Structure 1
Amino acid sequence: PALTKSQTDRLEVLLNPKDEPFRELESELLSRRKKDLQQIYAEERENYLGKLEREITRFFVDRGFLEIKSPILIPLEYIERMGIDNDTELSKQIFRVDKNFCLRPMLAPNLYNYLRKLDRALPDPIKIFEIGPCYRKESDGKEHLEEFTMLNFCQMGSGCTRENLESIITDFLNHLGIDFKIVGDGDTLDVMHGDLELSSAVVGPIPLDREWGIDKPWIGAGFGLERLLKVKHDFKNIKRAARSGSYYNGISTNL
């Protein structure tokens, strides 16, 4: 009569935010999910994460930011240089590769290097951004992924005010159609969606800049793309938005 917890878990996997006797309930949902995949295959054919990356890219390129693609595999030394010592949480979340490298847990190091180098060639202000995979060992699984995708944009030189930063964040999220609230937490702000952190943003300069050969004011923010998708598509578990073999655009592939 009553559905078991395992059966309910199975049906929830097949349930989409849009949906309103077990084997019958499962057959119904399976039919609907196959139809959803068939529609995607027939029309759009674009992956949610890939498409969001392209939409975000266009937004920043159009607003004067240079598109950067830097290494995902980085020197372990960069982590130390970011002020991440055995005293912070991140120190234990690092995925090491070999004895001198790791999977980047963030985009800041490579972007610091580009701000420094580009300042020798480009007119002020320097505006750049990168979107790409970042990695962190995590205990949570409902809001955190060990493999995720970050957008980090930044500007250095003129116009690096909290007002400008909040303005870009606002136009960005209103563009994507994602509700948010900017709250305080160098000047550090968090862009929240309810109790979910969409982004951490900062108004420099900060002491850390010296280690990277940076001596100008700057502003920047990092957003997790899977969290943006999660909110936008009303996914309950972030795994539905992740690179995966288990979901395609939020639809279960175990049909």
Structure 2
Amino acid sequence: PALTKSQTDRLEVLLNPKDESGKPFRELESELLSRRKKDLQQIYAEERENYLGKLEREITRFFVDRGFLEIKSPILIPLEYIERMGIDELSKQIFRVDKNFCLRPMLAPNLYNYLRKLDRALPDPIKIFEIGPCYRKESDGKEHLEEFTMLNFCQMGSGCTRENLESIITDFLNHLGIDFKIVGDSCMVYGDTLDVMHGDLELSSAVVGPIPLDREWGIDKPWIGAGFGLERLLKVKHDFKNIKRAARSESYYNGISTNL
């Protein structure tokens, strides 16, 4: 008669946010299976784009159009970058590779290096961004992924104000159609941050520099910047209950169960 907790977990795997007893499990499951197959058939017939890849392209266009240079830097980075980031906590979260390398947990160290290098070539202000994989060993699963995709944009030189930072953040999220509020906060690496929140979900940490860490990276100018999780953004935008629906995954494609 009543659904078991296991049967309910199974149907919840198959349930999309848009979907609207005493029908048996097998018929509810069969109905959901049929709707999800059709969802995939529709993607496949019409658009064929992955949400994560698509979101990356749309964000890329946004920042290129606003004068930010698109970076593609290494994902596998020297372990020394972590120490030079002032990380020794987040330190338990580092995936190490070989004796000397690790999977980057953030984009900041490589973007510090690009900021310094490009200051020799490019006019003030220097505007750059990267979108790409980042990795953190994580105990949670509801808002945390071990493998995720971060956007980090930043500017250095003139115009590096808190007002300009907030304005970019605001134009960005309004462009994406994502509701937010900007709250003051802090963390170990940076300060002193602004946190961009969706209800109780952190979409972004943002910082108005300078900060004392800059000197370690050969940086001696004002800067502003923010990092956003693309899977968090997708999660809010598609109203996914679990962030795993927005991840690189063999179990979900565009938030649709692939176990059909």
Cα–Cα, structure 1 residues 47 and 151, in superposed 2: closer, same or farther, change >3 Å? Answer: same
Distance in 2 (CA, whole Å) between partners of 1:7 and 1:187 is: 46
Query: What is the distance in 2 between the residues matched to 1:187 and 1:81?
Result: 19
Q: Distance in 1 between matches of 2:142 and 2:99?
A: 31
Q: Secondary structure at the match of 1:40?
A: helix
Which residue in 1 is equivalent to 2:233? 228
SS in 1 for 2:169: helix
2:86 is paired with a residue whose SS is coil
Cα distance, 1:164 vs structure 2: 0.1
Is contact 1:142–1:237 with CA below 8 Å preserved after alignment?
A: yes
**1:229 Cα shift?**
0.1
8 A contact 1:136–1:146 mirrored in 2: yes
Residue 105 of structure 2 is matched in structure 1 by 105
Q: What is the correspondence of 1:185-196 to structure 2 with a 5 Å cutoff?
A: 185=185, 187-196=192-201
Identical counterparts, % of pairs:
100
**Structure 2 CA distance, aligned partners of 1:73 and 1:112?**
16
Gaps of 5+ in 1: none
TM-score using structure 1 length: 0.98
Conservation of the 8 A alpha-carbon contact between 1:187 and 1:204: no
CA offset digits 1:133-164 (Å, max 9, x no partner): 00000000000000000000000000000000
Partners of 2:80 and 2:118 lie apart in 1 by: 22
> Match of 1:7?
7
Match of 2:251 in 1: 246
Q: CA deviation at 1:24?
A: 0.4
Distance 1:188 1:27 in 2: 48
User: TM-score of the superposition, structure 2-length normalised?
Assistant: 0.96
Task: Give the Cα separation in 2 of the matches to 1:224 and 1:74.
Answer: 19
Q: What CA deviation, in whole Å up to 9, does each residue of 1:18-77 have, x standing for no partner?
A: 001000000000000000000000000000000000000000000000000000000000
| Coordinate RMSD, CA, aligned | 0.5
| SS of corresponding position for 2:150 | strand
Q: What's the secondary structure of 1:120's corresponding residue?
A: coil
Classify the secondary structure of the residue corresponding to 1:209. helix
Q: Which residue of 1 aligns with 2:179?
A: 179
Q: Deviations over 1:76-109 (max 9, x none)?
A: 000000000xxxx210000000000000000000
C-alpha offsets along residues 191-245 of structure 1, whole Å, 9 cap, x if unaligned? 0000000000000000000000000000000000000000000000000000000
Q: Which moved further from structure 2: 180-189 or 39-48?
A: 180-189
- What per-residue deviation string (whole Å, max 9, x for no partner) do you get for residues 155-195 of structure 1? 00000000000000000000000000000015410000000
- Secondary structure of 2:13 counterpart: helix
Residue 242 of structure 2 aligns with which residue?
A: 237
1:38 aligns with 2:25: no
Q: Give the Cα separation in 2 of the matches to 1:216 and 1:144.
A: 33
The answer on 1:205 being equivalent to 2:226 is no
Give the 5 Å matches for 1:46-195.
46-84=49-87, 89-185=89-185, 187-195=192-200
Q: How many residues align?
A: 251
Runs of 4+ aligned residues of structure 1 deviating over 2 Å after TM superposition are none
Residue aligned with 1:129, SS: strand
Answer whether contact 1:149 1:226 (CA < 8 A) is retained: yes
Measured in 2, the distance between the counterparts of 1:167 and 1:177 equals: 15
Structure 2 runs not aligned, ≥5 long? 186-190
Match of 2:222 in 1: 217
Q: Could you tell me how far apart the structure 2 residues matched to 1:238 and 1:214 are?
A: 36
